[PDB]
Amino acid sequence: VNSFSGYLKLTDNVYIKNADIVEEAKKVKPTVVVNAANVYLKHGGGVAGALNKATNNAMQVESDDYIATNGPLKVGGSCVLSGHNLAKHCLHVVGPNVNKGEDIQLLKSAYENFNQHEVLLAPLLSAGIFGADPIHSLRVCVDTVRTNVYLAVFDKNLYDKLVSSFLE
Numbered sequence: 001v002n003s004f005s006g007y008l009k010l011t012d013n014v015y016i017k018n019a020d021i022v023e024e025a026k027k028v029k030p031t032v033v034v035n036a037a038n039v040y041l042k043h044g045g046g047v048a049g050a051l052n053k054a055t056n057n058a059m060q061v062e063s064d065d066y067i068a069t070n071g072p073l074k075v076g077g078s079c080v081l082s083g084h085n086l087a088k089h090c091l092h093v094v095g096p097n098v099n100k101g102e103d104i105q106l107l108k109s110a111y112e113n114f115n116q117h118e119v120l121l122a123p124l125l126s127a128g129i130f131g132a133d134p135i136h137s138l139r140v141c142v143d144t145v146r147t148n149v150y151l152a153v154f155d156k157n158l159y160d161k162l163v164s165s166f167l168e
């Protein structure tokens, strides 16, 4: 459990690896995997789509039941659901979608959710379709998260860019 290998230590508590977060979850068996969620927990693409596909749609079936009963999340908010075959727990965190005019300031609130878990496997929040600058997201992660966070970045050129930012 929580067998993270090959990570680069950026700060006392933030580590980063050029890896596919699904293959990391399968290798590492983390207590917590973080999903880059939306407020309706519709896992139709990006990390959310990849994680749900890896669970054989278990995640989407559970999420649909959660939303029908409980209503949507708030931007900056989170819920803990089953980690299925990937982790003990999935922390579904909603970062702002700046592509849709949501406030980038809520990225701090999104990362604050990580502090309720001792160790996490996570993507950068508000990246990809959510439209935030990934170098900014990593800075907010480092500034906000006090617990141990292992970041998985799939794209090599983005990974090198991110590492060249805290180290150059």
Ligand SMILES: Cc1cc(Br)c2c(c1)C(=O)C(=O)N2
Residues within 6 Å of the ligand: 008, 160, 161, 163, 164, 167, 168
């Ligand atoms: C200055 C600098 C830049 C990059 Br990208 C790096 C490093 C150091 C590392 O040590 C590493 O692994 N990637």
